[PDB]
């Protein structure tokens, strides 16, 4: 692993989930049973590290 950086366009391997983008702080509410998120049509919209 490495260290994570926010609000800069990076590439990320979150537990085998490979994607690209800008990470920032989310006002959404994950319940503890949740593992990750998606919003519409299998695009991971939020992730808890």
């Amino acid at each position: 692993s490495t260290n994570l950086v926010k609000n800069k366009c990076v590439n990320f391997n979150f537990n085998g989930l490979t994607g690209t983008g800008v990470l920032t702080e989310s006002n959404k509410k994950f319940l503890p049973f949740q593992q990750f998120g998606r919003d519409i049509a299998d695009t991971t919209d939020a992730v808890r590290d």
Partner: protein
């Protein structure tokens, strides 16, 4: 079902589940409301 029947008569409901399709609604907090 297992009871802690004290040495001295309890109510519950059981239904059987069936395969079919559903439409579920989520609110803001990621939970089910309808």
């Amino acid at each position: 079902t297992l009871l802690a029947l004290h040495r001295s008569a309890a109510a519950y409901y059981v239904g059987y589940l069936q395969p079919r399709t559903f439409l579920l609604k989520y609110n803001e907090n990621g939970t089910i409301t309808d």
